[PDB]
Amino acid sequence: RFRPSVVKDCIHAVLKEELANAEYSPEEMPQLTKHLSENIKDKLKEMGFDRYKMVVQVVIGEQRGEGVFMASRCFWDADTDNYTHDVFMNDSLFCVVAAFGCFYY
């Protein structure tokens, strides 16, 4: 079964590992977000959720005093399918990672 707290802990571990010294740069940054989304997806594979489709979304942006809102309304089977998220935020950027695990019948 998809465990949101363990998935959140692993997501937080990767976010703290990678984004601790990361500043804003639009040149390196699309590749960085694609790599982060793929890496979070692959580590949720390595956790090993059987018969579970995985949806990972990463939204990172510049910090300048801006106004951001991230939220989701979704339509799943509430007994088997579940979700989590994490937020990293430093001097130069903000990062949001959302994970949605959906059991397949």
Binding site: G65, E66, M70, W76
Partner: protein
């Protein structure tokens, strides 16, 4: 398979700071900035920025436990057979006629 719409799932909420100079709130912004600078400059009257204590009074929670009274649980078996019925009746009539004969003397 039951599929249900989930609730509000907020993942991130960053309030803005950057308000445009062309925005309608910009003059309120500038007046608030000037008032905050005036406050940060002036400490005239007594201790103008005196730090004060306050604390809500609630709680004092103590412990007593409750266990319901256990209904005592007993198995029992009976014998409803007509032969036992007639034998029992013969036994009580025999003991009644036995005890009825001792009062004459």
């Amino acid at each position: 398979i039951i599929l249900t719409e989930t609730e509000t799932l907020r993942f991130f909420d960053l309030p803005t700071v950057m308000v445009s100079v062309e925005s309608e709130e910009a003059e309120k912004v500038t007046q608030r900035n000037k008032n905050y600078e005036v406050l940060c400059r002036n400490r005239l009257g007594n201790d103008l920025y005196v730090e004060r204590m306050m604390q809500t009074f609630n709680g004092a929670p103590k412990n007593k436990d409750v266990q319901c009274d256990k209904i005592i649980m007993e198995d029992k078996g009976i014998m409803s057979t007509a032969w036992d019925l007639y034998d029992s009746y013969n036994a009580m009539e025999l003991v009644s006629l036995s005890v009825k004969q001792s009062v004459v003397e």
